Ligand binder design. Structure first.
Ligand SMILES: Nc1ncnc2c1ncn2[C@@H]1O[C@H](CSCC[C@H](N)C(=O)O)[C@@H](O)[C@H]1O
Length: 315
């Protein structure tokens, strides 16, 4: 007893067992299935012509025969489109990145299949750097929209949790490599399933992502000092890290190259910082800081021009 969804690009079919799993109050797998079908129809205009006669909202999510008919209608449309491509028509171009709406659906799908008990994420020690909170898809999308990233960039999420910031950026951008590093056992374990589910689903949709790695580790380790130094774009949700960890992070950031960037939920230097004789050791001497469009996040850019100009002025 299963439901199967053929891949538009001919990857292995997505197979669901029946009954379908319960996710939470607001989401179940039957509606994920319907939304997947709707999204593939967005992905492939010709699929709409084949599917346009069926009213999706009219099926019965609680009935197996009803959902199996829906899946079979979709699979037959996929076959028909595949025959169209065998003829004069040109197949869908591979290597494309997903549209933002599709990517939001993919990550929700990856998350719901991956994090089985989301309440375990709340089991952290309070008032410690392990306090867990998730940056929303929208904030990450706004960051991707507000900062340039190219194949010359290396992206790191420090304290990557279950890894969904890394996946989103890897799907949306050209960075040479994307990484995230998570110390705590519970999010790091989930991130292994997230990694697996993401590669499977992206292949099933026929969408491309840049290269990425989700690692278990401690970003304060001796090995991570050099890796931070060599990173062009750092994302860190430091909201709960506290002064000692933020101070350790400032020391690492101080080895970054000119033009290196840090996006954080709490600023590492004041926005108004004015360099003078008293503050010369502050990290504000080496970086510009601006608030991203407002929950506020901050973009820091390594600029030693600030410190260099203060010394030239003393002469
Ligand atoms: N020294 C350290 N090394 C690796 N991860 C750390 C760390 N200190 C704290 N963390 C992790 O940082 C995470 C912050 S919650 C942020 C999760 C994710 N990046 C997001 O923004 O959605 C927590 O999961 C915590 O375990």
């Amino acid at each position: 007893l299963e439901l199967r969804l053929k891949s538009p690009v001919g990857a292995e079919p997505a197979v669901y067992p029946w009954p379908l799993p319960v996710y939470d109050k607001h989401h179940d797998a039957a509606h994920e299935i319907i939304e997947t079908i709707r999204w593939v129809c967005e992905e492939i205009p010709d699929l709409k012509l084949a599917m346009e006669n069926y009213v999706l909202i009219d099926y019965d999510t609680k009935s197996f025969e009803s959902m199996q008919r829906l899946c079979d209608k979709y699979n037959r449309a996929i076959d028909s489109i595949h025959q169209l491509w065998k003829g004069t028509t040109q197949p869908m171009k591979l290597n494309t990145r997903p549209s933002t709406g599709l990517l939001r659906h993919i990550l929700q799908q990856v998350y719901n299949h991956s994090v089985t008990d989301p309440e375990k994420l709340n089991n952290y020690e309070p008032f410690s750097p392990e306090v867990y909170g998730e940056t929303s898809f929208d904030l990450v999308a706004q960051m991707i929209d507000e900062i340039k990233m190219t194949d010359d960039d290396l992206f790191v999420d420090l304290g990557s949790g279950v890894g969904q910031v890394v996946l989103q950026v890897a799907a949306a951008t050209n960075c040479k490599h994307h990484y995230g590093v998570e110390k705590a056992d519970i999010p790091a374990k989930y991130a292994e399933t997230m990694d697996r589910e993401f590669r499977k689903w992206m292949k099933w949709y026929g969408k491309k992502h840049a290269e990425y790695t989700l690692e278990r580790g401690d970003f304060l380790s001796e090995e991570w000092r050099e890796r931070i130094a060599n990173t062009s774009v750092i994302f860190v949700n430091n909201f709960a890290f506290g002064p000692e960890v933020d101070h350790q992070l400032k020391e690492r950031f101080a080895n970054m190259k000119e033009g290196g960037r840090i996006v954080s939920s709490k600023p590492f230097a004041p926005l108004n910082f004015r360099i003078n004789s008293r503050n010369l050791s502050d990290i504000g001497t080496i970086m510009r800081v601006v608030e991203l469009s407002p929950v506020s996040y901050y973009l820091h850019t390594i600029d030693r021009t600030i410190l260099e100009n203060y010394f030239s002025s003393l002469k």
